[PDB]
């Protein structure tokens, strides 16, 4: 048994809050929107890792005009610079969060709103999926 790449749908994962919504352009046809209205609000996801090792981290979100800017932490550790999820067009936003080493077990992926693009109308996180690339 070696590490396999996996896609974990935000609407299927256990999360601390967030509303499940349908969208024909979302992975799985659904997403989970965290309706943050300002900074320091956070949503937690429980993310299983069956095999210890190194992974590249990819986030898929919806492209909405009120997407915020988020700091990912894993198990309380900052991962990556804050990721600004505002784009001017498109159906989805896909972002590369770099590499980590993850132990075997279930990890806490915390998304904290830390700001928003000046063009954005809000602070929200319409997360579609988390993809762990071995
Ligand atoms: Ca999805």
Residue-range domains of the chain with CATH: 6-133 (2.60.120.260)
CA distance 105 to 92: 29
Residues 6+ apart with CB under 8 A from 98: 56, 57, 79, 80
Contact 29, 23 (CB under 8 A): yes
Residues 6+ apart with CB under 8 A from 87: 63, 67, 93
Alpha-helix residue ranges (DSSP H) falling in the chain: none
The DSSP symbol for 29 reads G
CA 23, 25, 30, 34 torsion: positive or negative?
Answer: negative
Å from CA of 125 to ligand 1 middle: 13
- Quoted resolution (Å): 2.0
Long-range contacts, stretch 77-81, CB < 8 angstroms, 24+ apart: none
Burial class (CB in 10 A: 0-12, 13-18, 19+), 118: exposed
Å from CA of 26 to ligand 1 middle: 5
**Among 60, 100, 59, which residue's Cα sits nearest to residue 79?**
100
Å from CA of 11 to ligand 1 middle: 6
Burial class (CB in 10 A: 0-12, 13-18, 19+), 53: middle
CA distance 58 to 97: 6
Q: How far is CA 30 from the centre of its chain?
A: 14
CA distance 76 to 92: 27
Residues 6+ apart with CB under 8 A from 78: 71, 72
**Among 98, 116, 112, 96, which residue's Cα sits nearest to residue 41?**
112
Å from CA of 27 to ligand 1 middle: 4
State the method.
Answer: X-ray
Angle at 132 between CA 11 and CA 83, to 5 degrees: 75
């Amino acid at each position: 048994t070696a590490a396999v790449s996996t896609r974990l749908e935000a609407e299927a994962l256990t999360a601390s809050s967030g509303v499940i919504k349908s969208n024909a352009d979302a992975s799985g046809g659904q997403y989970r929107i965290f309706n943050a209205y300002g900074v320091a609000e956070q949503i937690d996801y429980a993310v299983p890792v069956s095999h210890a090792g190194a992974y590249d981290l990819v986030l898929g979100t919806m492209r909405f005009s009120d997407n915020g800017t988020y700091q990912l932490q894993i198990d309380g550790n900052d991962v990556g610079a804050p990721v600004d999820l505002f784009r001017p067009s498109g159906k989805v936003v896909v972002v590369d969060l770099g590499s980590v080493t993850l132990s075997a077990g279930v990890h806490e992926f915390t998304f904290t709103a830390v700001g928003k693009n000046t063009s954005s109308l809000g602070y929200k996180l319409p997360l579609d999926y988390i993809q762990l690339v071995s």
